[PDB]
From a paper:
While the amino acid sequences of these proteins bear little similarity to known corn rootworm-active proteins, cross-resistance evaluations, competitive binding studies and comparison of protein structures indicate that AfIP-1A/1B kills WCR through a mechanism that is similar to Cry34Ab1/Cry35Ab1. AfIP-1A represents a 441 nucleotide gene that encodes the AfIP-1A protein of 146 amino acids with a deduced molecular mass of about 16.1 kDa and predicted pI of 4.8. Cell lysates of cultures of all transformations were inactive against WCR in diet assays when each protein was assayed alone but proved insecticidal when both proteins were present.
We were able to determine structure of AfIP-1A(I20M, T135M), an insecticidal variant of AfIP-1A, to 1.8 Å resolution by x-ray crystallography. In the P21 crystal form the structure of AfIP-1A is a dimer with monomers consisting of 11 beta strands with one short α-helix at the N-terminus. Three surface loops, residues 77–82, 103–109 and 128–131 are also highly mobile with weak or missing electron density. The monomer structures are virtually identical except for the above 3 surface loops and the flexible N-terminal polypeptide segment. The superimposed structures reveal a high degree of structural similarity between Cry34Ab1 and AfIP-1A. The major structural divergence is observed within the region spanning AfIP-1A Pro46-Ile62 and Cry34Ab1 Thr33-Asn37. Cry34Ab1 has a simple four amino acid coiled region connecting β3 and β4 whereas AfIP-1A contains a three residue turn, five residue β strand, and five residue α helix in the structurally equivalent region.
Author numbering: 9 to 154
Write the structure that this text describes.
Amino acid sequence: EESKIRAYAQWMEITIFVVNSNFKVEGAYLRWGKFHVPGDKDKEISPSQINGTIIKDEDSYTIASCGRENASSGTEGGFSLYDGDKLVFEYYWDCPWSGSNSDELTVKDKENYTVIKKGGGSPSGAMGNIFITVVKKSLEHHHHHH
């Protein structure tokens, strides 16, 4: 009952909201901690339950991970988002039990997508809530082919 309070003290929730296409989560993994149903750290889900998830246009989806009860140095992992067969971004976080939070968002097609993260990086204490927006550029607005 106090093993978990401790381990749960390092936690993140990442919400991906998308516009102008349907996108797919793939490549989710963890090296430390567990994934779980957002809002309920006692309900673990696997990478495989995340991978393949489609985020529909004008919807979001949240991934959540925290420390493992009586085990882990916090949470450390990542995932990738695709638009069909096109890799849009790779995300990675390392939020250790004892140490400084870090992350990294690698945008793979800046030309066709606007991808913006809020939260994340290197805050104190628990990693916390992180938000990524992804907008597939509309030619009539962005004129982004040339």
